[PDB]
C-alpha cells in the first residue's frame, strides 16, 4: 500500500547549536566521585546540527548514516513513530525497521519493499512497506512512549552490533546536561549507510501536529567525564574543542590555576595510504604455455620451467573458458602475492573422466601410469575443453 503525498514544502533544512548534549554511559560499570577519560564515538560539543519541523511542514528525507547518529525529538502527542535503516532501501539488500505503535514496539530486519512515501495514519492505517522476502531477526517488546516530550537517541553500528541509547525528558534545545543510558543491543551484522524517520498523519484532508526533530553526527574523539557522589554523570569536557578544554583534558581536572601548561603537538591526520613499486616488466611467458597450438601426449607430458620473471597469474585466473580451478596446497587468491623459487608447468591432453585422477590420493590409469602427483603437492591444475 503506497500513497504519494504532494503537500510537501521545499525548504533548506534548519540549523541549530548542539550545546552540551550527546553524552552516554560508555560502559555498564559503576564509578562514583571519580573523573574518567574515554575515547569513543561521541557527539562534538557546540556542533551545528540539522533541524526539521513538521506541522504544513513535512521533513522526511534520506540522510547518510556516517559513523553514527544522534536523534533528538521535541514532541507532543507522539506523532513520530519509527525509523528505517539500510543501504539500497529495497528488497535488493536487507533493511532494518523499527516502529512503536500504540500497543508495543516492532523490530524487523528483512528485505522489505518500502513505499516511496512511508507514513502512518485514532491510528489504524500503516503504509511503510509492500513486500518482505527474507528476514533475519525479529523482536517485540513494550512501547517506548507547549511541547512536553524530549527523546534523545544514539544509534551506533560497531562490529556487527547495533547499539541504541535512549533518554526521556519532560520539558530550541534547552541549555543543560543529561547523559544517555544504554538501552538495547542488536546482533544485526549488515551494512548501514542511510536512514529516515517515520511519521503518522492525523485524519479528520490531513494535517500534521507541531513537532520538531534534530539530527547530529557522531565523531571519534575523547571525552573527560565527571561522576558525582551518587554515581551519575554531571559534567563532561571535550578533549578537542578549544585549547582550554585540551588543557583541562590533559591535567585531568575541571579547574586550572594561573600558569602555562603543555598539552600536545601540531598534527595532521592521515587520509590515504600510498603504495609504490617500479614498472612491471619482464612478464613470464604464459602465452606459449596455454595458447600453444599443439600439446604433447599425457605420458610424454611437456615440462617447462618458469623463473626470473613476474608471473601475472590473474591472466589465467580471469578466463571463464577455463572452467575447473582445482588447486592443492595454496589458495588461488594468494597466487598474486606468494613468491616461489621456480614454477613447473606440465602440459598434456586427457579425457574428461580422467581429470579427477591428477590429484593427491587418487587412483586410475593416468595417475598410476601416465602422470603421478605427490600427496603433498603444492600447486594448481587447470583443465579446459
Residues that bind ligand NAG (CB under 6 A): 229-230
Min separation Cβ 361 and another protein, Å: 4
Contact partner, 182, from another protein, ligand NAG, none, Cβ < 5-8 Å per class:
another protein
Shortest separation between residue 234's beta carbon and ligand NAG, angstroms: 10
Cell numbers at residue 340, please? Answer: 616461489
Cα separation, 111 vs 238, whole angstroms: 40
Q: Which is nearer to another protein, 122 or 275 (CB)?
A: 275
28 binds, among another protein, ligand NAG, none (CB under 5 to 8 A by kind): another protein
Q: Minimum distance between the CB of residue 309 and another protein, rounded to whole angstroms? A: 23
Q: Which helix (H) or strand (E) holds 316?
A: helix 314-317
What is the rounded CA–CA span in Å between residue 25 and residue 170? 20
CB nearer another protein, residue 159 or residue 257: 159
Closer CB to ligand NAG, residue 12 or residue 170?
Answer: 170
Residue closer to another protein by CB (options 290, 328) is 328
If contact means CB under 5 to 8 A according to the sort of partner, which of another protein, ligand NAG, none does residue 242 touch? none
C-beta of 153 vs 328, nearer to another protein: 328
| Cβ proximity to another protein, 138 vs 288, nearer residue | 138
Report the C-alpha gap between 253 and 307 in whole angstroms: 65
Cell numbers standing for residue 137: 531477526
Q: Rounded to the nearest whole angstrom, what is the least distance from the CB of residue 31 to ligand NAG in the complex?
A: 14
Residue 368 binds which entry of another protein, ligand NAG, none, with Cβ cut-offs from 5 to 8 Å by kind? none
Cβ–Cβ under 8 Å, residues 166 and 192: no
Which triple of cell numbers denotes residue 288?
A: 606459449
Determine contact, residues 189/160, Cβ cutoff 8 Å.
Answer: yes
How far is it, in rounded angstroms, from Cα 161 to Cα 181?
A: 17
Residue written as grid cell 603504495 = 275
Between 230 and 363, whose beta carbon lies closer to ligand NAG? 230
Give the nearest distance from C-beta 186 to another protein in angstroms: 10
CB under 8 Å to 347, separation ≥6 — which residues?
A: 289, 292, 295, 296, 301, 302, 304
User: Residue 306 or residue 380: which is nearer to another protein going by CB?
Assistant: 380
30 binds, among ligand NAG, another protein, none (CB under 5 to 8 A by kind): another protein
Residue 281 interacts with, from another protein, ligand NAG, none (CB under 5-8 Å by kind): none
DSSP string, 156-200: EEETTEEEEEEEEEE----S---EEEEEEEE---S---EEEEEEE
Q: State the nearest-atom distance from the C-beta of 142 to ligand NAG, in Å.
A: 26
Distance CA 290, CA 287 (A): 5
CA distance linking residue 370 with residue 188, whole number of Å: 54
**Please, what is the minimum distance in Å from the beta carbon of residue 224 to ligand NAG?**
21
Binding region for another protein (CB under 8 A): 27-32, 34, 93-94, 159-160, 181-182, 187, 189-191, 230-232, 318, 320, 328-329, 331-333, 356, 359-363, 375
The H-or-E segment that residue 302 falls in is strand 302-306
Gyration radius of the chain's alpha carbons:
31
* DSSP 8-state symbol, 60: -
Question: How far apart, in whole angstroms, are the C-alpha atoms of residue 280 and residue 312?
Answer: 10
Judged by beta carbon distances under 5 to 8 A according to partner kind, the member of ligand NAG, another protein, none in contact with residue 288 is: none
CB of 109 to another protein, least distance (A): 11
Whether the Cβ atoms of residue 55 and residue 202 lie closer than 8 Å to each other = no
Q: Name the residue whose CB lies closest to ligand NAG.
A: 230
Binding partner at 356 among ligand NAG, another protein, none, C-beta below 5 to 8 Å by kind: another protein
**Which of the listed partners (ligand NAG, another protein, none) does 141 bind, with a CB threshold of 5 to 8 Å by partner kind?**
none
DSSP state string for 185-196:
EE---S---EEE
Smallest distance from ligand NAG to CB 33, Å: 9
Nearer to ligand NAG, 232 or 336 (CB): 232
Q: Do residues 366 and 298 lie in contact, with contact meaning Cβ atoms separated by under 8 Å?
A: yes
Amino acid at each position: 500500500q503506497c500513497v504519494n503525498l504532494t503537500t510537501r514544502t521545499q525548504l533548506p533544512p534548519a540549523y541549530t547549536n548542539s550545546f552540551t548534549r550527546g553524552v552516554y554511559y560508555p560502559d555498564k560499570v559503576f564509578r562514583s566521585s571519580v573523573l574518567h577519560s574515554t575515547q569513543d564515538l561521541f557527539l562534538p560539543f557546540f556542533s551545528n546540527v540539522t533541524w526539521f519541523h513538521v506541522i504544513k511542514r513535512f521533513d522526511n528525507p534520506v540522510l547518510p548514516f556516517n559513523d553514527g547518529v544522534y536523534f533528538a525529538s521535541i514532541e507532543k502527542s507522539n506523532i513520530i513513530r519509527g525509523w528505517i535503516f539500510g543501504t539500497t532501501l529495497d528488497s535488493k539488500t536487507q533493511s532494518l525497521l523499527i516502529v512503536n505503535n500504540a500497543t508495543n514496539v516492532v523490530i524487523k530486519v528483512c528485505e522489505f519493499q518500502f513505499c516511496n512515501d512511508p507514513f502512518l495514519d485514532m491510528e489504524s492505517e500503516f503504509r511503510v512497506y509492500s513486500s518482505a522476502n527474507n528476514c533475519t531477526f525479529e523482536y517485540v517488546s513494550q512501547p517506548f512512549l507547549n511541547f512536553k516530550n524530549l527523546r534523545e537517541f544514539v544509534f551506533k553500528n560497531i562490529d556487527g552490533y547495533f547499539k541504541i541509547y535512549s533518554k526521556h525528558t519532560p520539558i530550541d534545545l534547552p541549555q543543560g546536561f543529561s547523559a544517555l543510558e544504554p538501552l538495547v543491543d542488536l546482533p544485526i551484522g549488515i551494512n548501514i549507510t542511510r536512514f529516515q524517520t517515520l511519521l503518522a498523519l492525523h485524519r479528520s484532508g490531513w494535517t500534521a501536529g507541531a513537532a520538531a526533530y534534530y539530527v547530529g553526527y557522531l565523531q571519534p574523539r575523547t571525552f573527560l567525564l565527571k561522576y558525582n557522589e551518587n554515581g551519575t554523570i554531571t559534567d563532561a569536557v571535550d578533549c578537542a574543542l578549544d585549547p582550554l578544554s585540551e588543557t583541562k583534558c590533559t591535567l585531568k581536572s575541571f579547574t586550572v590555576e594561573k600558569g602555562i601548561y603543555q598539552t600536545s603537538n601540531f598534527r595532521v591526520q592521515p587520509t590515504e595510504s600510498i603504495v609504490r613499486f617500479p614498472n612491471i616488466t619482464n612478464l613470464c611467458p604464459f602465452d606459449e604455455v596455454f595458447n600453444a597450438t599443439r600439446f604433447a601426449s599425457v605420458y610424454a607430458w611437456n615440462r617447462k620451467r618458469i623463473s626470473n620473471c613476474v608471473a601475472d597469474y590473474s591472466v589465467l585466473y580471469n578466463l571463464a573458458p577455463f572452467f575447473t580451478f582445482k588447486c592443492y596446497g595454496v589458495s588461488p587468491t594468494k597466487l598474486n602475492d606468494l613468491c616461489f623459487t621456480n614454477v613447473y608447468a606440465d602440459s598434456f591432453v586427457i579425457r574428461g573422466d580422467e581429470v579427477r585422477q591428477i590429484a593427491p590420493g587418487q587412483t586410475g590409469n593416468i595417475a598410476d601410469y601416465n602422470y603421478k602427483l605427490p600427496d603433498d603437492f603444492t600447486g594448481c591444475v587447470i583443465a579446459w575443453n
